[PDB]
Design a protein around this nucleic acid. Sequence first.
RNA 1: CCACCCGAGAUUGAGCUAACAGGUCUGUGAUGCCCUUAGAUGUCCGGGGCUGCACGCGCGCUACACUGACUGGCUCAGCGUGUCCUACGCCGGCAGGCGCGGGUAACCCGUUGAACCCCAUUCGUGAUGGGGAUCGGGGAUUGCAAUUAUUCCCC
Lengths: 305, 122
Amino acid sequence: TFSKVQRFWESNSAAHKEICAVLAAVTEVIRSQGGKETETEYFAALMTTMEAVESPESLAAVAYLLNLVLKRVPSPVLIKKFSDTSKAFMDIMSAQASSGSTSVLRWVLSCLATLLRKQPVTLQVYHGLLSFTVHPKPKIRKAAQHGVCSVLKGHPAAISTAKFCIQEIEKSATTTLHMLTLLKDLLPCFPEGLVKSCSETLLRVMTLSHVLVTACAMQAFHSLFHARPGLSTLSAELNAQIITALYDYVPSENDLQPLLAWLKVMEKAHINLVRLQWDLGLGHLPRFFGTAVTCLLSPHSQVLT
Amino acid sequence: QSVQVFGRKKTATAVAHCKRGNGLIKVNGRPLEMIEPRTLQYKLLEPVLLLGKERFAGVDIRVRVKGGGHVAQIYAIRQSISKALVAYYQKYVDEASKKEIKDILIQYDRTLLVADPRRCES
RNA sequence: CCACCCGAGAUUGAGCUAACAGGUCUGUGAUGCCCUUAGAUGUCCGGGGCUGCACGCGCGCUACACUGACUGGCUCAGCGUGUCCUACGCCGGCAGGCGCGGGUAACCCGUUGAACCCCAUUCGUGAUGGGGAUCGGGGAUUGCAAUUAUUCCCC
């Protein structure tokens, strides 16, 4: 059972739309390797091609097939030979990072994400996945971000990525948007102390006035308050601190891009204060209502509405 | 414990962040005497020379400037510094000092608080 | 607008292709004339020209400099673009070549690292180092082709 690598190797739009191609049938019947789904004998047999060969459109094709087949839960076998997969995949990772190809790295990162979602060295694999968010390629970076999001939402590994993201905030100006996307997609699944540290560091980057990073990190505020986090993830006193700390900017009066989402994020935050402890939420409400009544004086009808 | 204001001229926008300090006035990591049009230097010391260093004793102010040219950036710098001091004295100091400083600045010049509405037209 | 009470009736029957200037456009005549080895521009091939220059009438660019020219350093934009826009390294005096990546694009060019302007050096009122035309040599790209200089670089 071979030549599916040669099937995906051809890239012509006449053959992608066929039912026999990798679009539909590989997702259904190719997973049943030998009549039973699934066997990684294909995976273990393609070691001789994925080692010491750097030929394009064959490494990428087998990476695509591995990414498509790996999702059909061979979970005890995955737990058994996770060490072999991790070692083979990290040497492939180092070789491709030294070489500089995109498609092979993108799909091996995707199937690495599937592997880590299905399952000490696991922490090493997690940092191996995590290190390529600041990678400049938009296809590598988006795949790595989506993979980290799928791994975390599908947690003992939140501490490492929270500390990491804080750290490349602290060293770093165009990767700031990418790690702010990481915060927007990963803030709810953090513990309370790390939520506090990320919030403090996010106000430290609120000290700057670049419109993109400020807008996307207050969108990360919107993401964290939108999910209605639990008590262990966000406490009432920390939420009170970050709602009394966010009063210090109020862009101007009529900026109309951060003002609407601003009233949205204090809306969601005060909802969370009321949901956690209703009397304290009602106690912190009057300053919000006073500032809202003040910002009905804006010349823009959208702010008013 | 800190305030954040902006000041615009034509296209140049200078954002000023003010806090409890030790008497240092900083723009883009450079001292205010270290801005390359030294011919137009006394325009950007106008809050300091008008108001003295005595009331700038415990103020830390940072200004970051985007866009514009050179002269428009300088006017944005002085406008942003002045609005930062006014908002700081609004939020953390009494109101009499606010109206006194505003009266001095308005009787000196009008552009240093309110911005020129005119910009480049199509 | 819907449904219902009461009520005989909460709607049962009669009358009203033609008109347009509202738009706009290529069908009918056995239609009148004039032409038809005098092809209503006959197809193709090769080479030229469209730039040629005494002169008038006019749009523009560069200038006649000291509020300036040269050299070095400094620091600031926006409207827009791109599968030709280019990032990086090497070979290069310089135009440019070579190996490599991103971008079918608020992502990569690009924090668009712009020019005037500012600060220092030399010049010192003369066809001057202002001004650059016109010429003489070389080199490199674009393109089947640059000779009647396509363009750019260097004396």
